[PDB]
Ligand binder design. Structure first.
Ligand SMILES: Nc1nc2c(ncn2[C@@H]2O[C@H](COP(=O)(O)OP(=O)(O)OP(=O)(O)O)[C@@H](O)[C@H]2O)c(=O)[nH]1
Ligand SMILES: Nc1nc2c(ncn2[C@@H]2O[C@H](COP(=O)(O)OP(=O)(O)O)[C@@H](O)[C@H]2O)c(=O)[nH]1
Ligand SMILES: [Ca+2]
Ligand SMILES: [Mg+2]
Ligand SMILES: [Mg+2]
Lengths: 423, 59, 440
């Protein structure tokens, strides 16, 4: 009876959001019609976290679908589980964002934001005790990046004591030739640093490399990248959806993962990744090749880590192997946060796997991600390239400089605590 | 026996006042924390108005 | 008279409370519906077990207990569990949002919204008592409710009941089963706020209980159920003098006189024996001497520390079962001639002994063997300060960087409360050093 309200904005946000509901609906035994046909009572014990139960014993995702164009949301409605979403929770426009953060944040998005809040408000009123919100979106586009960060600010104004979580997709030249993505992404990070409590960094650069290098996919599609996002999102929400002791709600997760409010950008990880023992799950789980953000954790230090093991296995062996990895890699865990690695175990494994492992790391090595975006940002901002797309919507030059400085400061803060010492 | 009564009453008294001060100081601090949060958010809305006006005048 | 009200706060306190009251019902012959065929006085009585159980006109024996948690899922198991008919609905109090492992939310933001209702329900129990003796408060150090709401409750109880005695059973955190990085913070904050409001506190180191279950009972990965059933036995031994009577029975308050030389030095170290599985206990009878010797094996302590490197200020032996003073005295004599039991120079060295003849009980499906005799030692040793030192060190590591402090400030707390609490702990560690120094 601790409800989460889900929001998905823009093309990317709606696609990964739709597949998120497909996966967890299968895990909870919910079919596309909303009826339960599972075999375990553990599936329904915390179903209220993500589902409303309309009379008739059908479960309706507590989900809101937003986009400044109908295209992506029309495929959701006509796809699998499209009929499970509440039709009133579809809020779309016709103008579009044109991959312009300013359009989605200040102009077109500002016209539609009020109607979205009406739906957020209606859903939140019927909550026994709202936990907070989780937003799926990309930072390289216009709607998900611009209007998504706008929704965050407006929701926070009305629910300032609730947790704001985001699944943010970072742009990569390997998965988009659209050139103004460094701008839209830097402007988005500027907002996320200030108005979110927890952000999972879904780096498209990492997803591509996993599909190509590891899984041997010459031409990775958005569907291939999204199969990783779905498995990851399922993993990092397992503690919220099933009975458990560790990080069972958004606030407790934030308290365990965020030692400083601005440093709330996590590095997801998943294992196995195959185109299986507990020692191998744990070794791979801490390997750079299994990270959903294109950063090497051995280039920084871990502030906090959450490990989630799924499937039937030996808890004694899990505890042993988690102690083993920390001891053998003690240099990569800050001394001044004792016992900063917490472990959860869920008896229910994902679909198609006998056992899996999900990794949530708050590592200073994440600066490599922001450094990559910053390098792409300054390369164009130095040339004032494409700024008329943004000044034409009313923006000022300072706002670009401010977003730049704030992201560069975020990098410095990660380096500060990476260099910090106990003695 | 009167001194025993006085000390026990002073312990109750001082415990009641210390707690009343903590709960009051805590309410004011938390309210000030939220006030600053919304005043920053409302400044963003005010800034969004300038952006939309800066564009309208550009036409 | 001499009624005792128990208060179980947070998940740890509630779940330990479930194990304790189940064990009590078995020790006294009370059924899950509260009926007790052996009790021939219906509706009331002055028997020893009435210190912990009230009686209704319908023959139900009701725990003098309140369960409080800021979220409902744990107490909900009590509402639907095997002993749901044992408690009146008003004894089980729940909120909708927990403290998110944040002392500030348990003591202020969330706790303040339910504190008045909790005090009201405690008052309802106190009004039923003709001679209330005090309270027993079960809570964890690490949880936001167990730390923050307990401190608030303790402060309020001092106001509403004066210096009426309040005893704690406190769960000291262990990495093997901990659920929050900030548990050192919450531990220091609640220890400081409760220090002046507690007369006696028994700390239970989860790592000590964890190791005991692994080593003595061969439980590979002990669960809370494993830990809590062991903790129940220790709590039972401690309260047995209040719930039973006998010629050789010694009241817990009389041990207290010896265990607390100064108000702040009120943290006894408990050691329990025998902890043995049914397989090893078979055809192996453990004598009085053997279980007494086990009390001085540090591996059987409830808190990890080395009394061999500290000084004793009191030693109490609480036996239960087939035990007579003759065998006790012989066992004690052997131990003094072969163990490093160094007392401070300002305390007598004699051991204080109590014997309850009711033998120990085990819950069905448990791991502990049923034995004919058991013992819990309660000693006041400077070595228990080791537990403070370990916790204070983890506090200093994080607080030097103000790690996670924003979660507390955001809920209304100030850094001054952190430093104030830490300084009180430093003085407490200092107090344990001074009491161990020889007199000039
Ligand atoms: N021995 C024992 N320890 C427990 C038990 N349950 C929780 N703990 C310990 O208590 C600490 C966490 O505090 P909890 O009691 O679970 O939290 P809480 O009091 O409900 O506070 P919030 O959940 O934050 O509102 C950790 O150190 C756990 O290891 C239990 O049943 N037995
Ligand atoms: N993983 C993934 N990334 C996407 C998807 N669609 C778009 N993106 C990324 O998002 C960015 C474009 O933003 P987009 O969501 O299409 O614009 P929007 O409709 O205004 O939100 C690009 O950098 C893409 O790599 C998708 O289905 N999956
Ligand atoms: Ca009776
Ligand atoms: Mg696109
Ligand atoms: Mg709890």
């Amino acid at each position: 009876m601790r409800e989460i309200v889900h929001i998905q904005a823009g093309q990317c946000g709606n696609q990964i959001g739709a597949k998120f509901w497909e996966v967890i609906s299968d895990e909870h035994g919910i079919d596309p019609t909303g009826s339960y046909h599972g075999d375990s009572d553990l599936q329904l014990e915390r179903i209220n976290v993500y589902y409303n139960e309309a009379t008739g014993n059908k479960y309706v995702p507590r989900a809101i679908l937003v986009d400044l164009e109908p295209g992506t949301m029309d495929s959701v409605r006509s796809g699998p589980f499209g009929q499970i979403f509440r039709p009133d929770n579809f809020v779309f426009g016709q103008s579009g964002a044109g991959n312009n953060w300013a359009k989605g944040h200040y102009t077109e998005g500002a016209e539609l934001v009020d109607s979205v809040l009406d739906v957020v408000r209606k859903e939140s009123e019927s909550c026994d005790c709202l936990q907070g919100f989780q937003l799926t979106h990309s930072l390289g586009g216009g709607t998900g990046s611009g209007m998504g960060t706008l929704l965050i600010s407006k929701i926070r104004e009305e629910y300032p004591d609730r947790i704001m979580n985001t699944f943010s997709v970072m742009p990569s030249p390997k998965v988009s030739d659209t050139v103004v993505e460094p701008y839209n992404a830097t402007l988005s990070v500027h907002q996320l640093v200030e108005n979110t409590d927890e952000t999972y960094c879904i780096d498209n650069e990492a997803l591509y490399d996993i599909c190509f290098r590891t899984l041997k996919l010459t031409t990775p599609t958005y569907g291939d990248l999204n199969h990783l996002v779905s498995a990851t999102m399922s993993g990092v929400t397992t503690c919220l959806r099933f009975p458990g002791q560790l990080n069972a709600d958004l606030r407790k997760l934030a308290v365990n993962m965020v030692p400083f409010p601005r440093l709330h950008f996590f590095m997801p990880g998943f294992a196995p990744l195959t185109s299986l023992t507990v020692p191998e799950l744990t070794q791979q789980m801490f390997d750079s090749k299994n990270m959903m953000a294109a950063c090497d954790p051995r280039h920084g230090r871990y502030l906090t880590v959450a490990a989630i093991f799924r499937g039937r296995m030996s808890m004694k062996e899990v505890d042993e192997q988690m102690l083993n990895v920390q001891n053998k890699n003690s240099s990569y865990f800050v001394e001044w946060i004792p016992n900063n690695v917490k472990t959860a175990v869920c008896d229910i494994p994902p679909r198609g796997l006998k056992m899996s492992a999900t990794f949530i790391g708050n590592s200073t090595a994440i600066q490599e991600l922001f450094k990559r975006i910053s390098e792409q940002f300054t390369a164009m901002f130095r040339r004032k390239a494409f700024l008329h797309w943004y000044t034409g919507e009313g923006m000022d030059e300072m706002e670009f400089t401010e977003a730049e400085s704030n992201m560069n400061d975020l990098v410095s803060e990660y380096q500060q605590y990476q260099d910090a010492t106990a003695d | 026996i009167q001194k025993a009564i006085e000390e026990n009453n002073n312990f109750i008294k001082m415990a009641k006042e210390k707690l009343a001060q903590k709960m009051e100081s805590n309410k004011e601090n938390r309210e000030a924390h939220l006030a600053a949060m919304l005043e920053r958010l409302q400044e963003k809305d005010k800034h969004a108005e300038e952006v939309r006006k800066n564009k309208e005048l550009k036409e | 008279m001499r009624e005792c009200i128990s208060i179980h706060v947070g998940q740890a306190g509630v779940q330990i409370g479930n194990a304790c009251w189940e064990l009590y019902c078995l020790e006294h012959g009370i059924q899950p519906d509260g009926q007790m065929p052996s009790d021939k006085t219906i509706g009331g009585g002055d028997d020893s077990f009435n210190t912990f159980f009230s009686e209704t006109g319908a023959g139900k024996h009701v725990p003098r207990a309140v369960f409080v948690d800021l979220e409902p899922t744990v107490i909900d198991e009590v509402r639907t569990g095997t002993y749901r008919q044992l408690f009146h609905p008003e004894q089980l109090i729940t909120g909708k949002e927990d403290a998110a492992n944040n002392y500030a939310r348990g003591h202020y933001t969330i706790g303040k919204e339910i504190i008045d209702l909790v005090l009201d329900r405690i008052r309802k129990l106190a009004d039923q008592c003709t001679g209330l003796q005090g309270f027993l408060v079960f809570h964890s150090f690490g949880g936001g409710t167990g730390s923050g709401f307990t401190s608030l409750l303790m402060e309020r109880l001092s106001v509403d009941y004066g210096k009426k005695s309040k005893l704690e059973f406190s769960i000291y955190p262990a990495p093997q089963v901990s659920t929050a990085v900030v548990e050192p913070y919450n531990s220091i904050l609640t220890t400081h706020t409760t220090l002046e409001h507690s007369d006696c506190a028994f700390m239970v180191d989860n790592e000590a209980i964890y190791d005991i279950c692994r080593r003595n009972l061969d439980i590979e990965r002990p669960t809370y159920t494993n830990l809590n059933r062991l903790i129940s036995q220790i709590v039972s031994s401690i309260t047995a003098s209040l719930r039973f009577d006998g010629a050789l029975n010694v009241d817990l308050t009389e041990f207290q006189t010896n265990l607390v030389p100064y108000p702040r030095i009120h943290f006894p170290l408990a050691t329990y024996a025998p902890v043995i599985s049914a397989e090893k206990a078979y055809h192996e009878q453990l004598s009085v001497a053997e279980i007494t010797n086990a009390c001085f094996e540090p591996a059987n302590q409830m808190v990890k520390c080395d009394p061999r490197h500290g000084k004793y200020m009191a030693c109490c032996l609480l036996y239960r079962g087939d035990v007579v003073p003759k065998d006790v005295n012989a066992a004690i004599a052997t131990i003094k001639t072969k163990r490093s039991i160094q007392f401070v120079d300002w305390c007598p060295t004699g051991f204080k002994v109590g014997i309850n003849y009711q033998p120990p009980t085990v819950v069905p499906g448990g791991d502990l063997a049923k034995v004919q005799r058991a013992v819990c030692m309660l000693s006041n040793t400077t070595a228990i300060a080791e537990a403070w030192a370990r916790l204070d060190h983890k506090f200093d590591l994080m607080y030097a960087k103000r790690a996670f402090v924003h979660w507390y400030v955001g809920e209304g707390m100030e850094e001054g409360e952190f430093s104030e609490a830490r300084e009180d702990m430093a003085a407490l560690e200092k107090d344990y050093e001074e009491v161990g120094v020889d007199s000039v």
